[PDB]
């Protein structure tokens with residue numbers, strides 16, 4: 223009586239029932255479940271997530287080298303969430319946030335709750351009190367690395383020179399997740415890479431439903447003079463869709479994730495926009511000869527690149 227595929231399913235089902243939808247899943251599988259998500263502001267990355275954005279009520283971690291593009295995405299999330307009429311809280315602990323830029327990304331700073339904790343404990347706690355209030359859609363934390371314990375913030379000797387930070391970070395998540403689910407608020411934990419872990423990413427890794435690995439990969443020289451930098455995000459972990467997908471998206475200086483950029487990329491691979499010979503075209507239209515000229519084309523003739531986005535939106539989701 224051995225039938226693998228029938229015996230496998232029964233097992234898989236059990237596996238999912240004992241540990242939750244997504245415990246295990248074939249890699250090239252398509253997903254009925256839409257969740258309800260917060261657009262990552264990166265169409266590519268969105269598809270890359272397989273639900274069109276950051277799932278809600280889950281602990282997300284966006285890690286990666288400095289200036290890779292983590293924040294911007296975390297900020298875009300916020301902005302979107304707020305358009306959907308959601309309230310957002312920024313548990314700042316690095317003091318870098320540029321509200322100005324943030325508004326340019328569409329964030330409504332004036333309605334954005336900001337907190338700058340005195341300690342790691344406080345920082346996580348303050349965020350917990352807010353989470354379980356239920357009034358939030360998304361709550362971003364800046365720099366897991368900065369969630370330094372109190373005994374360390376205050377002057378405490380190199381005795382009980384423990385593995386204390388990550389501890390703090392586990393207990394805090396052990397209880398904040400439960401509420402995030404009940405609350406359905408999405409927690410984006412920005413965790414940045416170092417010197418020479420993060421002493422606190424050890425816990426996260428296991429408590430995060432989604433873990434994006436943000437990376438810098440190119441300087442958009444364009445007309446041989448800097449505009450912005452191209453980014454690549456790997457979805458190393460996804461418990462709401464098949465993991466390991468990949469997306470690339472532009473981020474010009476001063477500007478956030480380039481919509482037209484996205485369009486001209488996703489367009490090409492998905493072939494609605496056919497072009498090569500170092501030139502670009504759509505439905506026979508002369509877009510221009512460099513990704514930039516094109517980006518600009520779309521940026522200007524708003525009408526086009528709208529039917530494209532459309533055309534692309536259809537074929538995917």
Ligand SMILES: Nc1ncnc2c1ncn2[C@@H]1O[C@H](COP(=O)(O)OP(=O)(O)O)[C@@H](O)[C@H]1O
Nearest residue numbers: 288289290291292293294320323473474475476
């Ligand atoms: N305050 C700013 N002013 C101008 N450009 C910015 C600013 N912050 C971010 N950017 C742009 O957004 C990109 C990503 O920034 P950011 O997300 O802060 O890097 P990180 O990965 O350390 O969080 C930067 O490379 C730059 O192109």
